[PDB]
């Protein structure tokens, strides 16, 4: 997706609880650096629910696509308060931003 459009979405809907940079601080939610390829609930220093901790999934384009569409459906019991992003293209652009931002 479009990394540029993705940044705006993140800035507006995720930044209140998440940081994406290396060394990024944990807020209400965990820092997301190193997200791609990482299993659920593995950001060091953050205390996840057992639901997030044991989902047993690796974050990547396909998983994030499903998660971001409806978080609680994908991870029942999650303490992440977010209803989801319905438009497929918006999830794609956001996901493209995450791919970049969390690995640089």
């Amino acid at each position, epitope marked *: 997706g479009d990394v540029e459009k993705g940044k705006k979405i993140f800035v507006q809907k995720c930044a209140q609880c998440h940081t994406v940079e290396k060394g990024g601080k944990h807020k209400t939610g965990p820092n997301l650096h190193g997200l*791609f*390829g990482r299993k659920t609930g593995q950001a060091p220093g953050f205390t996840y629910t057992d639901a997030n901790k044991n989902k047993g999934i*690796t974050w990547k384009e396909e998983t994030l696509m499903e998660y971001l569409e409806n978080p609680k459906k994908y991870i029942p019991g999650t303490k992440m308060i977010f209803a989801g992003i319905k438009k497929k293209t918006e999830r794609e652009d956001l996901i493209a931003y995450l791919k970049k931002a969390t*690995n640089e």
Partner: antibody, heavy 117, light 108 residues
Framework: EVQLQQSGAELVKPGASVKLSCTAS????????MHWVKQRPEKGLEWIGR????????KYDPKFQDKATITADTSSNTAYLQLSSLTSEDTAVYYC??????????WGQGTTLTVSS | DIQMTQSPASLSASVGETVTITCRAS??????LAWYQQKQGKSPQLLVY???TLADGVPSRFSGSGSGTQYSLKINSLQPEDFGSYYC?????????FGGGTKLEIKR
């Protein structure tokens, strides 16, 4: 103990098709992406594409879109590569591999395909 | 589609020497660059992923660095078992292309 066992060597006639398999064990193919890579004798690696068995979603290098078809039977822990309208240009070793963005990265032993009349 | 330009195609070196292989992507790949090693007649093996993280079982004489479109694989004090071929591959976007490869051979 992760293992990726590929099918045996194949000898097929030009114009025919062939299907190679890659059976995993020690892991589920749904946990990562299953790739197919071609390598002609003494030449470099060519990424044909991959499949995300969990979502059935496939990706290909355009150069192979009309030649190869990657599938996966998540109900047998096996991935497959189907090559159509074979020519001498398809004679090569084909590797399957399971991996995505991290340290989990395992390759099969490869399958040698010879296309000849 | 992003293409990887790997150089040199051939590299002559001696045991004990330090050597460097480079990969240039046709577009920014944001550190999603892996390096694979392929010993003569064997299957490729992951050596480095995410541009700088050594893979499991990989000796510390290996190291990778880079960012954007430029990346490098450095081998310090080459060992006899290091001679073979090396390939980079980006994971940024489909297709995940491999560089042309580098064949590390013995100088004489």
């Amino acid at each position: 103990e992760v293992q990726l066992q590929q099918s045996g060597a194949e000898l097929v006639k030009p114009g025919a098709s062939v299907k190679l398999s890659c059976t995993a064990s020690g892991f589920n193919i749904k946990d990562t992406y299953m790739h197919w890579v071609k390598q002609r004798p003494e030449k470099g690696l060519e990424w044909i594409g991959r499949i995300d068995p969990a979502s059935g979603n496939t990706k290909y290098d355009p150069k192979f879109q009309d030649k190869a078809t990657i599938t996966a039977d998540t109900s047998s822990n096996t991935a497959y590569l189907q090559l159509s309208s074979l020519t001498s240009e398809d004679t090569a070793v084909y590797y399957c591999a399971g991996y995505d963005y991290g340290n989990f990265d395992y390759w099969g032993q490869g399958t040698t395909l010879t296309v000849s009349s | 589609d992003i293409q990887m330009t790997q150089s040199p195609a051939s590299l002559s070196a001696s045991v004990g020497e330090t050597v460097t292989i480079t990969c240039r992507a046709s577009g920014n790949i944001h550190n999603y660059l892996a390096w694979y090693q392929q010993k003569q007649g064997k299957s490729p093996q992951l050596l480095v992923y995410n541009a700088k993280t050594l893979a499991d079982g990989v000796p510390s004489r290996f190291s990778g660095s880079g960012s954007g479109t430029q990346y490098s694989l450095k081998i310090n004090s080459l060992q006899p078992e290091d001679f073979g071929s090396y390939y980079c591959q980006h994971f940024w976007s489909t297709p995940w292309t491999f560089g042309g490869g580098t064949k590390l051979e013995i100088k004489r």
